[PDB]
Amino acid sequence: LQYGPLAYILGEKTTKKMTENSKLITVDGNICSGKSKLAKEVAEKLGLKHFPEAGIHYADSTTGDGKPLPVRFSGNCSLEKFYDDPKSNDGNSYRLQAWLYASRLLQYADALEHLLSTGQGVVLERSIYSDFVFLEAMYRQGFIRKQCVDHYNQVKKVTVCEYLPPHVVIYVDVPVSEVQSRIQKKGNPHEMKITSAYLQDIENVYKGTFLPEMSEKCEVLQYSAWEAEDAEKVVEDIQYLKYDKGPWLDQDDRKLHNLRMLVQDKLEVLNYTSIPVFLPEVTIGAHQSDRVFQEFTELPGRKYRAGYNEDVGDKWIWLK
Amino acid sequence: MNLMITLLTNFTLATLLVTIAFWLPQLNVYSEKTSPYECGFDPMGSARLPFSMKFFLVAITFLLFDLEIALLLPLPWASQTTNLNTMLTMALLLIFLLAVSLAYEWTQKGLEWTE
Amino acid sequence: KFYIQEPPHGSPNWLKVGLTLGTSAFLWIYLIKQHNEDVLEYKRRNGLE
Amino acid sequence: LLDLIWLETILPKTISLAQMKMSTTITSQKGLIKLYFLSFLITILISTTLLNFHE
Amino acid sequence: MNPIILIIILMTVMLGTIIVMISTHWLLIWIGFEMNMLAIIPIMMKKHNPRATEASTKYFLTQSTASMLLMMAIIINLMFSGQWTVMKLFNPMASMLMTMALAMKLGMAPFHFWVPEVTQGIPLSSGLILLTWQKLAPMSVLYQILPSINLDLILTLSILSITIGGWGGLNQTQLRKIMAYSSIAHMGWMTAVLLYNPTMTLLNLIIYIIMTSTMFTLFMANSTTTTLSLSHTWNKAPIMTILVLITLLSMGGLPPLSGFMPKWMIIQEMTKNDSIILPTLMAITALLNLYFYMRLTYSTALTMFPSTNNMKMKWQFPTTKRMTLLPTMTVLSTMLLPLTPILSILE
Amino acid sequence: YPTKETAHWKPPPWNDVDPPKDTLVSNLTLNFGPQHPAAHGVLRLVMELSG
Amino acid sequence: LLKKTTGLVGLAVCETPHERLKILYTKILDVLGHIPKNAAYRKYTEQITNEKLSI
Ligand SMILES: CCCCCCCCCCCCCCCCCC(=O)OC[C@H](COP(=O)([O-])OCC[N+](C)(C)C)OC(=O)CCCCCCCCCCCCCCCCC
Ligand SMILES: CCCCCCCCCCCCCCCCCC(=O)OC[C@H](COP(=O)(O)OCCN)OC(=O)CCCCCCCCCCCCCCCCC
Ligand SMILES: CCCCCCCCCCCCCCCCCC(=O)OC[C@H](COP(=O)(O)OCCN)OC(=O)CCCCCCCCCCCCCCCCC
Ligand SMILES: Nc1ncnc2c1ncn2[C@@H]1O[C@H](COP(=O)(O)O)[C@@H](O)[C@H]1O
Numbered sequence: 001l002q003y004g005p006l007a008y009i010l011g012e013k014t015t016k017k018m019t020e021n022s023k024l025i026t027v028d029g030n031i032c033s034g035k036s037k038l039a040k041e042v043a044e045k046l047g048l049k050h051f052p053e054a055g056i057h058y059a060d061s062t063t064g065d066g067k068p069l070p071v072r073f074s075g076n077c078s079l080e081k082f083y084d085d086p087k088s089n090d091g092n093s094y095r096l097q098a099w100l101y102a103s104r105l106l107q108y109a110d111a112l113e114h115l116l117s118t119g120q121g122v123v124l125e126r127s128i129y130s131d132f133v134f135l136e137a138m139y140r141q142g143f144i145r146k147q148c149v150d151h152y153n154q155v156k157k158v159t160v161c162e163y164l165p166p167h168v169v170i171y172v173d174v175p176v177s178e179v180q181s182r183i184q185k186k187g188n189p190h191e192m193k194i195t196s197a198y199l200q201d202i203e204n205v206y207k208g209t210f211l212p213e214m215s216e217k218c219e220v221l222q223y224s225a226w227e228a229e230d231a232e233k234v235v236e237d238i239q240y241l242k243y244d245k246g247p248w249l250d251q252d253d254r255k256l257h258n259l260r261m262l263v264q265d266k267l268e269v270l271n272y273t274s275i276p277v278f279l280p281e282v283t284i285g286a287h288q289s290d291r292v293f294q295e296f297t298e299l300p301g302r303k304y305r306a307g308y309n310e311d312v313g314d315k316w317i318w319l320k
Numbered sequence: 321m322n323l324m325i326t327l328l329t330n331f332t333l334a335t336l337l338v339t340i341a342f343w344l345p346q347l348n349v350y351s352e353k354t355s356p357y358e359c360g361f362d363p364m365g366s367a368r369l370p371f372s373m374k375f376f377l378v379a380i381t382f383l384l385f386d387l388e389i390a391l392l393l394p395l396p397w398a399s400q401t402t403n404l405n406t407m408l409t410m411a412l413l414l415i416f417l418l419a420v421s422l423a424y425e426w427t428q429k430g431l432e433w434t435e
Numbered sequence: 436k437f438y439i440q441e442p443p444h445g446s447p448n449w450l451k452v453g454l455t456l457g458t459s460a461f462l463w464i465y466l467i468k469q470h471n472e473d474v475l476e477y478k479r480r481n482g483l484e
Numbered sequence: 485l486l487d488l489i490w491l492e493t494i495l496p497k498t499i500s501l502a503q504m505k506m507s508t509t510i511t512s513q514k515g516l517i518k519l520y521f522l523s524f525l526i527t528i529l530i531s532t533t534l535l536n537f538h539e
Numbered sequence: 540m541n542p543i544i545l546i547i548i549l550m551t552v553m554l555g556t557i558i559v560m561i562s563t564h565w566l567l568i569w570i571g572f573e574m575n576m577l578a579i580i581p582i583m584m585k586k587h588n589p590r591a592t593e594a595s596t597k598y599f600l601t602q603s604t605a606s607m608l609l610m611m612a613i614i615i616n617l618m619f620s621g622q623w624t625v626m627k628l629f630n631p632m633a634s635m636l637m638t639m640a641l642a643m644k645l646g647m648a649p650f651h652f653w654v655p656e657v658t659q660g661i662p663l664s665s666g667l668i669l670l671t672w673q674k675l676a677p678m679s680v681l682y683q684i685l686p687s688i689n690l691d692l693i694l695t696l697s698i699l700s701i702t703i704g705g706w707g708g709l710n711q712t713q714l715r716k717i718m719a720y721s722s723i724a725h726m727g728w729m730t731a732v733l734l735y736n737p738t739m740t741l742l743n744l745i746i747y748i749i750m751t752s753t754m755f756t757l758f759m760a761n762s763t764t765t766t767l768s769l770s771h772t773w774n775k776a777p778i779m780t781i782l783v784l785i786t787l788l789s790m791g792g793l794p795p796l797s798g799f800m801p802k803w804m805i806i807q808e809m810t811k812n813d814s815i816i817l818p819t820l821m822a823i824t825a826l827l828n829l830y831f832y833m834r835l836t837y838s839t840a841l842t843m844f845p846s847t848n849n850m851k852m853k854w855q856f857p858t859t860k861r862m863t864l865l866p867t868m869t870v871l872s873t874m875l876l877p878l879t880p881i882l883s884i885l886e
Numbered sequence: 887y888p889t890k891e892t893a894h895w896k897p898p899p900w901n902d903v904d905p906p907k908d909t910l911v912s913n914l915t916l917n918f919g920p921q922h923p924a925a926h927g928v929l930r931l932v933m934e935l936s937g
Numbered sequence: 938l939l940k941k942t943t944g945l946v947g948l949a950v951c952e953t954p955h956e957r958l959k960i961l962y963t964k965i966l967d968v969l970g971h972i973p974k975n976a977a978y979r980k981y982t983e984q985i986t987n988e989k990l991s992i
């Protein structure tokens with residue numbers, strides 16, 4: 001392939017490219033915290049690479065042509081049906097949550113891959129260290145079961161221990177009333193069904209569990225709604241941070257080599273998302289899985305490996 | 321024969337200086353004079369608790385470097401052989417291997433103590 | 436263009452194709468040369484000419 | 485009676501239950517170094533005294 | 540681990556086994572086993588979790604005890620022979636102690652109590668190193684001392700290994716313990732024909748190394764260590780289910796596959812020496828191994844256990860793993876039976 | 887095949903990494919007391935030493 | 938001139954002091970705008986912050 005132990009042996013050390021601009025930044029907040037432009041603005045002043053927030057179709061954007069696959073092939077879930085009926089009987093809530101956790105795990109792997117390969121920091125939106133709060137809101141509002149929380153805890157316990165926290169966590173204080181006002185001004189007819197208690201639970205698992213556990217392994221920058229509208233303010237604060245907490249200090253060439261050999265193998269990243277815990281929300285049975293897999297194979301450019309498809313026009317396959 | 325007599329003499333008048341040390345003075349034994357010494361106040365816990373070794377990797381590597389003076393020690397005798405360039409090459413090979421081991425133990429911060 | 440990224444097997448690794456074909460052609464010519472040397476040595480050691 | 489029970493009993497099910505029972509007896513160890521090496525001691529003592537494998 | 544240090548440690552494991560293989564002095568045999576053990580200990584602790592420390596402690600104690608018995612057998616040989624040539628032993632006490640040492644190093648029953656524990660505790664690559672490469676140095680020394688090995692001792696070890704390794708894999712859902720009890724049974728197969736024809740012992744060793752390397756390479760390629768995780772392979776890459784099907788049918792000894800090649804030849808060399816009862820018990824006992832092999836093929840290939848929704852993401856990513864020699868080992872492990880008289884090159 | 891013995895055996899973890907079961911290291915409490923040539927006459931350092 | 942040390946222990950040398958002071962003084966004024974105009978802390982701190990910022 002491209003990177004391996006031989007590249008580490010013959011000279012490609014990952015701390016020779018590690019500059020002071022190599023900072024992994026995660027911009028967090030509630031459902032309409034206005035962080036969406038803010039992260040891009042934090043990415044455009046610091047010269048960093050912005051990743052959009054992982055929806056259902058992030059893996060569709062990273063592979064193939066980048067166009068979104070149909071929802072039976074990726075996700076088997078809908079954010080809008082979760083906004084309609086969060087207490088559904090098909091278990092769309094936890095299925096949406098587990099697919100979004102796998103998509104954010106893939107996104108965080110992509111962020112670390114760009115960070116360790118190029119030496120350029122990546123600005124993220126709601127990484128895997130902050131995904132769990134939605135689950136807890138979904139657990140407090142009676143949307144899911146405790147077995148779903150146990151499945152999420154086992155997957156998170158075996159997946160997040162292999163990765164690092166970000167350098168900077170940016171959190172945008174927007175209260176529940178202003179989130180509701182921005183939802184009503186947004187115009188999305190499903191998003192206006194989000195209840196007040198669900199937003200308050202998101203804010204409580206933010207301010208009660210996430211921020212007391214990240215403030216020791218990284219640096220928090222908790223902004224309010226009015227001061228986060230100026231990007232120069234946030235970047236102006238980022239460029240004068242005294243980076244002293246977290247496990248980023250004790251990372252040599254070897255530890256980050258092991259991290260990079262973990263990260264670039266995407267199936268090793270996604271190994272433990274599909275653990276054999278037969279939960280009725282996420283377990284797709286045999287005939288449906290076979291039917292959807294054999295429909296996925298017949299998609300254009302998906303039948304073979306990414307350089308071996310004559311239907312989309314790959315040449316010289318008899319010499320590859 | 322003389323070595324056993326000499327060791328028996330040294331052990332004997334080292335243990336006859338102890339049996340006239342315990343039996344000659346006057347004892348006033350009570351269960352505060354024989355208490356453990358902890359600078360005046362009572363000791364917190366036992367002294368049989370684990371006393372965590374900080375120098376443990378150096379303690380292991382001492383067992384691998386102490387064998388070297390079971391290997392490098394015939395060198396006053398090995399210089400008396402009639403295949404001498406081979407002996408010199410193998411001797412400098414042994415001290416060089418000890419030195420490469422010590423260099424590797426330096427560079428991975430193994431000679432430093434923990435915490 | 437189809438793929439959103441450049442795939443690692445998009446272009447043939449012409450170094451690897453050249454090494455593969457050169458190694459395979461060398462093994463064939465050495466096999467045929469060894470077999471001709473073997474039939475020559477067998478026809479020589481036994482007089483089967 | 486015969487070809488759903490007794491001829492079904494005598495050849496396949498007796499052997500199946502025997503191999504199940506022996507499989508449960510062998511694999512039911514506790515993972516202890518103490519008991520494994522004590523079984524090694526008993527093996528050496530049977531090999532020397534009982535079976536004369538040192539002869 | 541630092542890959543320079545990984546290279547040096549693996550070359551030292553290989554150097555230990557080669558020093559066992561090439562040397563004509565007993566002290567160099569013992570040095571090779573000590574070097575092999577000393578270098579393979581960090582391969583078991585590549586991940587640094589308590590199961591690797593537990594497995595490494597158990598492996599160190601078993602191999603250290605076996606090396607003690609080996610060196611006592613060597614010193615008794617020095618007493619009763621005055622020399623050090625790697626050949627037959629000149630005392631049945633030294634013969635028994637060296638046979639016990641090599642049976643502990645192979646993990647043959649009733650010294651089998653470390654092989655499923657250590658194999659469960661360690662990764663799949665170190666499990667492959669353990670179950671293939673460490674089965675080469677004691678089999679070399681057993682090949683070299685066969686004029687002095689007690690017949691009753693090595694046949695008792697052999698059939699006791701075959702029976703206990705047969706029974707052990709039936710109560711398992713972890714794939715590494717399945718391969719470990721398969722190893723116990725197959726080392727019993729190899730050492731049974733040691734005093735009758737050791738060429739068949741070498742043939743069984745090579746075919747078992749090929750099949751075990753095939754199965755561990757399939758497990759590493761699929762990223763599965765349990766039965767129920769291997770059972771999702773049909774939804775991810777259906778050719779791997781075909782390969783584990785043909786390889787587990789090969790390892791059970793079913794014709795027309797190459798894993799029938801050693802076993803049959805062993806019977807072919809034991810009915811010549813007028814032993815009919817013993818390979819019959821061996822062959823009937825091998826059906827237990829075939830039973831848990833068929834259990835894994837039912838769970839993986841011949842049916843379709845239900846997968847999850849998250850598997851749909853792994854459809855979009857091919858395998859970027861160095862599946863080293865996997866089609867070559869699969870072809871050698873399944874379609875080699877018409878080339879059965881190639882075994883004469885091992886004479 | 888679950889028996890009476892093989893009933894408390896939970897299945898092993900997925901990444902083969904066990905939680906550390908953080909038993910207390912029990913730092914040795916030295917009493918660097920007042921009768922000492924270093925503590926200047928009257929000073930009771932209750933210290934905790936990791937060795 | 939690139940001053941090497943500050944003379945104080947733990948006081949690290951600031952590379953760009955002028956822009957950092959402009960940042961902190963406008964940030965103090967931005968936070969300090971949220972105080973009522975009749976409060977003496979606002980008037981006095983705006984006074985001394987504008988003095989230091991003009992310097
Ligand atoms: C389907 C289920 C039932 C299956 C039944 C299968 C057949 C039943 C009998 C099998 C006996 C074992 C194979 C016999 C091969 C005979 C070859 C030969 O020449 O023998 C002469 C040899 C004679 O030895 P010899 O030839 O070395 O002696 C030298 C020659 N003389 C005699 C002059 C000194 O016989 C034997 O060695 C022993 C034969 C009997 C073996 C007893 C052990 C097996 C018991 C029955 C097992 C049945 C299946 C078990 C599994 C059931 C299901 C799980
Ligand atoms: C070929 C001749 C024989 C060589 C083999 C025999 C050696 C005999 C002596 C045994 C030495 C054993 C231990 C050696 C350890 C060396 C590695 C080492 O310590 O490197 C670190 C050191 C800097 O220390 P640091 O990392 O800051 O440590 C902090 C805590 N003090 O790094 C340094 O101080 C730099 C060390 C390298 C540069 C030394 C240059 C000396 C040149 C002398 C003239 C040429 C001599 C010929 C050899 C070639 C030298 C380039
Ligand atoms: C009678 C005496 C005869 C002596 C003959 C000696 C022949 C050679 C030695 C055979 C013994 C077994 C050799 C393999 C031992 C294991 C090697 C190993 O573990 O390599 C590590 C590597 C790991 O791959 P990766 O997926 O990157 O792992 C992730 C890291 N945890 O890779 C792997 O784990 C994958 C496996 C790599 C090696 C497979 C090929 C060698 C063995 C199969 C036989 C091939 C046919 C030719 C030789 C025939 C004889 C065996
Ligand atoms: N784990 C999750 N569960 C449910 N909804 C989520 C999750 N993560 C993100 N979202 C939704 O993603 C959107 C993010 O807001 P924005 O990207 O600012 O429009 C909101 O609709 C959130 O409810």
